[PDB]
Symmetry: C2
Subunit: 166 residues, 2 copies
């Protein structure tokens, strides 16, 4: 079986666990409850091919210092998430792309910038500046919603395909 | 207003007009009725940006000989469609990628291979061989359905994004 090892990285509050749960469980997590490490494995079919999504929902702050590195070495593909109503969350996307290139010892890794929570209207991070960071890295930018599920299968699949053409 | 000039090319029978109508009208066209040229213009929002899809649904055989060339010069991005139950339709995708590179005078054009009609189970063109043609061209491969609408916004958006990062 073909498989893909997706790590979902980025800051606290953003909606890392509410996207992974929307995709693997089809319901929204309104409940506040933070993460250390979490593997979801689903058998899926993407463009008629049988694959196993082996996702590792993690975090963005703790005593996960460069203890972050162990998971980054082995993740084939990364989802980088920011929240569109959180200026700081967008600015720390650098800090994560720099050590995903440090532990991967390559400038080209399959990734996706994800401007999450896109149904709230207190946007602070324009689409224009997140679509400009994303083509500065040579990467996609997809906008998603975990309350709504719009954007979720788009994000996750765009990434899987990026892992296919590496 | 940002806009994108999408040409939908490929053979007869494949479902070029049933994808363009599914996206711009949300219903399936079961009815048999062939094409010469057709512009659909919709105002859409893709990853929070306002854009105009200015699609030009066309064909794959007629007295559209290299009269095909006039539209290919001006289309910013191409959807190449084959039907998964039609071996020949897949094999003429070459004939279309060669003159989209001839009139565009470039080897890199934003494109998408589209294995349409994916809900029928008389597949003849495996996913494995269409995912291998697609990474041979350095392009996406998305599988779609116009009876179902699965794959339709994925195909069209993946292409728009490909036009953004050129
Ligand atoms: N409205 C809105 N809220 C969201 C969205 N996704 C998540 N949230 C909310 O944002 C908060 C945090 O969600 P989580 O999914 O727990 O985010 P997280 O990034 O995993 O945070 P940690 O695992 O602690 O690092 C929760 O209160 C969710 O209900 C979204 O798309 N829109
Ligand atoms: N089951 C199935 N049939 C499809 C699909 N999309 C289109 N068809 C059928 O395939 C036939 C042709 O559809 P059109 O959408 O007219 O295809 P076309 O490529 O535009 O053909 P021309 O414009 O003549 O070149 C019709 O009989 C549709 O009902 C699909 O996803 N699945
Ligand atoms: Mg979490
Ligand atoms: Mg037609």
């Amino acid at each position: 079986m073909t498989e893909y090892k997706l790590v979902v990285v980025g800051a606290v509050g953003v909606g890392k666990s509410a996207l992974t749960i929307q995709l693997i469980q089809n319901h929204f997590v309104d409940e506040y409850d933070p993460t250390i490490e979490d593997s979801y494995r689903k058998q899926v079919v993407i463009d008629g091919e049988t694959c196993l999504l082996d996702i590792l929902d993690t975090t963005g702050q703790e005593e996960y210092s460069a203890m972050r590195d162990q998971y980054m070495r082995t993740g084939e593909g990364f989802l980088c998430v920011f929240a569109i109503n959180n200026t700081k969350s967008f600015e720390d996307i650098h800090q994560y792309r720099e050590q995903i290139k440090r532990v991967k010892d390559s400038d080209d890794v399959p990734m996706v910038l994800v401007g999450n929570k896109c149904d709230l209207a207190a946007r602070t991070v324009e689409s224009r500046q997140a679509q400009d960071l994303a083509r500065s890295y040579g990467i996609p930018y997809i906008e998603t919603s975990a309350k709504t599920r719009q954007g979720v299968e788009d994000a996750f699949y765009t990434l899987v395909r990026e892992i296919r053409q590496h």
